[PDB]
Amino acid sequence: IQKTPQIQVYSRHPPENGKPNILNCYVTQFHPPHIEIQMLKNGKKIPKVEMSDMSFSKDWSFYILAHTEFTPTETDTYACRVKHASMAEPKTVYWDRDM
Template identity: 45%
Template sequence: MVTSDMKFVVIFGFLTAVYLVDSKFQAPTVQVYSHLPAKFGEPNMLICHVSQFHPPDITIQLFKNGEELTKANETDLSFGKNWHFYLTKHAEFMPMRDDKYFCRVTHASSPPRNIDWEANM
């Protein structure tokens, strides 16, 4: 027996597939920042916010001195009315004077990009 919920899922899936086939790639906008004003030696949160991209297949990685931060958390993938997606990844960190932090974003619209975190201290 086919329910109305099943019909909705099938129709939604079909419309999404048609939209994705007709869509063009949109490169992501990337912002890398800390939750609090940065102070060397004090705990903080490193945040990489990626928005306005399409299609939704994307990889976000956070790095400290070239090593990936493995305890990073990622939000659920979300989208706006225009079907452009956004996603945020974050990790606790303690900035020190010589540390280099960056976010690597891999998306089909362009080669992988590294965006540095600027401490502004």
């Protein structure tokens, strides 16, 4: 049966405005493994995103980590958008500015 992806978005270092950092999007609990993940800055696709190899957990569901350099500031939003057969529309999760 298909399982729907969960998406968590969080920063490698304390987010401090104007300071270069790393934003992570961790996508888990999904099946089947085919998926497309984009990271968004102000609603636009961020070009250089790096992905880990796909792997799977003890319960057999897949997971993968995407990450990108970013500089938070109080005029930019960040998000992670996922397309998967389990959902009719892409699911987008915004960084909550704290994580």
